[PDB]
A paper describes a structure:
Poly(ADP-ribosyl) polymerases (PARPs) are a subgroup of four enzymes (PARP1, PARP2, PARP5a, and PARP5b; PARP5a and PARP5b are also known as tankyrase1 [TNKS1] and tankyrase2 [TNKS2], respectively) that continue the reaction (PARylation) to generate long chains of linear and branched poly-ADP-ribose (PAR) on target proteins. PARP1 is involved in repairing single-stranded DNA breaks making its inhibition an attractive strategy in oncology especially in those cancers that have defects in additional repair pathways. Thus, TNKS activity promotes Wnt/β-catenin pathway, and TNKSs are potential drug targets for the treatment of cancers driven by Wnt/β-catenin pathway, most notably colorectal cancers. We determined crystal structures of the catalytic domain of PARP1 and the ART domain of TNKS1 in the absence and the presence of the ligands.
The catalytic domain of PARP1 includes a helical domain followed by the prototypical ART domain. Structurally, the helical domain is placed adjacent to the NAD+/ligand-binding site and limits its exposure to solvent. The crystal structure of apo-PARP1 catalytic domain shows that the ligand-binding site is largely preformed, and the inhibitors can be accommodated with minimal structural rearrangement. The second difference is in the nature of the donor loop (D-loop); in PARP1, it is longer and more rigid than in TNKS1. PARP1 D-loop has three proline residues in its sequence, which likely contribute to its rigidity. In addition, interaction with the helical domain might make the D-loop structurally constrained. In all structures reported here, a structural water molecule is observed (except for the olaparib-bound structures, where it is displaced by the carbonyl oxygen of the ligand; see later). This water molecule makes hydrogen bonding interactions with the imidazole sidechain of the catalytic His862 and the backbone amide nitrogen of Tyr896 in PARP1 and analogously with His1184 and Tyr1213 of TNKS1.
Residue numbers in the entry: 661 to 1011
């Protein structure tokens, strides 16, 4: 049977469940697909690699020499087989190297979720595989009409918050989907009337979306080192579309990406200017706000279904001596997020 879902929804389902895209992410990470194919990836293997990556960063912080670092770095490559032929693998000594591996493991965890959905469950050739994969997401997905009110506001948010420092590309909104993850509205109930509820961006690689729609935005596992995240292990958002769009990791070889709009209950924000690898918030705080030098103009904030949308053009925030060019918002309880929209974007690279 043929799917009756709208063509943009079918194309969205096709992109997020693409096995060749999952394999392409694993080749980007120099993973040996003979020793670690897509089907042999498992949570316990990724969690054990996160634990070794914590032992690696623990020694870097404790001023250990390259002789001691070598043994811990080699251990990481044992757990996550990389394809280096008969050469020694790149030494994980610097912070930029260890940071990249924590981020690789974050993507691998979501890839394992997506592939587990495709491989678990049933096979029925009489149904359209698009319809079958759609149901695995347990998310109602509707197309938002271009000439509707919510679409005008969303397109204005995209139009106004593209940073001048991210000028290597411009964005075109292809499709706007209104999404409703089953059980999420009920989970959000304790926070639905909290103050400082804002509609914020969350960008991610396309290969992470089957996991985000099936399980919602999650916090990194306990094995993951708290130092591998600027503000510790939470759920990150931005008010500048391009800061979030950069996390799609699109390129001229793959210029289409996906970005989320989520209602986030920020409440009492813990304001910070530099990295703070916290395990828990201070008492009475509900989120972290990383203070950027630039913020969408606060006077241009508008309300969409009771939620504040900071869609104003970027202006100076008045914040001096901060590590951040733009704001970032972090929550440490998954129940503080209610996903609202999912956009498909075309990145027009100007380089």
């Amino acid at each position: 049977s043929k799917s009756k879902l709208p063509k943009p929804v079918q194309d969205l389902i096709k992109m997020i469940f693409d096995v060749e895209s999952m394999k392409k992410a694993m080749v980007e990470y120099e993973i040996d697909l003979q020793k670690m194919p897509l089907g042999k990836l498992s949570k316990r293997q990724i969690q054990a690699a996160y634990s070794i990556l914590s032992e690696v960063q623990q020694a870097v912080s404790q001023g250990s020499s390259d002789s001691q670092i070598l043994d811990l770095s080699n251990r990481f490559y044992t757990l996550i087989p990389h394809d280096f032929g008969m050469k020694k693998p790149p030494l994980l000594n610097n912070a930029d190297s260890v940071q990249a591996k924590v981020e690789m493991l974050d993507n691998l965890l979501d890839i394992e979720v997506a592939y587990s959905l495709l491989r678990g469950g049933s096979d029925d050739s009489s149904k359209d595989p698009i319809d079958v994969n759609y149901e695995k997401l347990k998310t109602d997905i509707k197309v938002v009409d271009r000439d509707s009110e919510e679409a005008e506001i969303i397109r204005k948010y995209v139009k106004n918050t593209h940073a001048t420092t991210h000028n290597a590309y411009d964005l075109e909104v292809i499709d706007i989907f209104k999404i409703e993850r089953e059980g999420e509205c009920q989970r959000y109930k304790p926070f639905k009337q909290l103050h400082n509820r804002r509609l914020l961006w969350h960008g991610s690689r396309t290969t992470n979306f089957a996991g985000i729609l099936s399980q919602g935005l999650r916090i990194a596992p306990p094995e993951a080192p708290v130092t591998g995240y600027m503000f510790g292990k939470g759920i990150y958002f931005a008010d500048m579309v391009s800061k979030s769009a950069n996390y799609c990791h699109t390129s001229q070889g793959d210029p289409i990406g996906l970005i989320l709009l989520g209602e986030v209950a920020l409440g009492n924000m813990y304001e910070l200017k530099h990295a703070s690898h916290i395990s828990k918030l201070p008492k009475g705080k509900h989120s972290v706000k990383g203070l950027g030098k630039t913020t969408p103009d606060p006077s241009a904030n508008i309300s969409l279904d009771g939620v504040d949308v900071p869609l104003g053009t970027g202006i100076s925030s008045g914040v001096n001596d901060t590590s951040l060019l733009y704001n970032e918002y972090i929550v440490y309880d998954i129940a503080q997020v209610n996903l609202k929209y999912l956009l498909k974007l075309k990145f027009n690279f100007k380089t």
